[PDB]
Design a protein around this ligand. Sequence first.
Ligand SMILES: Nc1nc2ccc(F)cc2s1
Length: 133
Amino acid sequence: HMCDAFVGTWKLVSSENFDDYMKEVGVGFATRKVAGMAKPNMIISVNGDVITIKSESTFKNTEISFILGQEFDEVTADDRKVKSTITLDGGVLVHVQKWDGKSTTIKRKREDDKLVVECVMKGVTSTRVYERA
Ligand SMILES: Nc1nc2ccc(F)cc2s1
């Protein structure tokens, strides 16, 4: 019942500072422009200990499945090959990606009827808000 409140189909409704976050990550111009336009749907489901987060947009379809605390390979939407670990910390899903000696953390939490996604790369934060589809 660990992630019950995250389960469902979610649609992006707002984004702040995402271009600056992507710059900090190292995303190139053309990908930042196209990816910044996208309004992904995120589909979250749980089956036993396995959590799946699928994202569908006009830019890319991506999918991760994982067990909390157990590192996995992820190819990100911007084509980074990263090593990811996702844990629950006080009800917040905390997703750390490591690649090329770099690190970024993505936190997902329920706030009212929203699912709020905070993406941090060094000093730069972007906030992306999803509502139920
Ligand atoms: N499947 C996905 N499409 C996008 C589009 C933009 C983005 F920032 C993340 C994702 S994941």
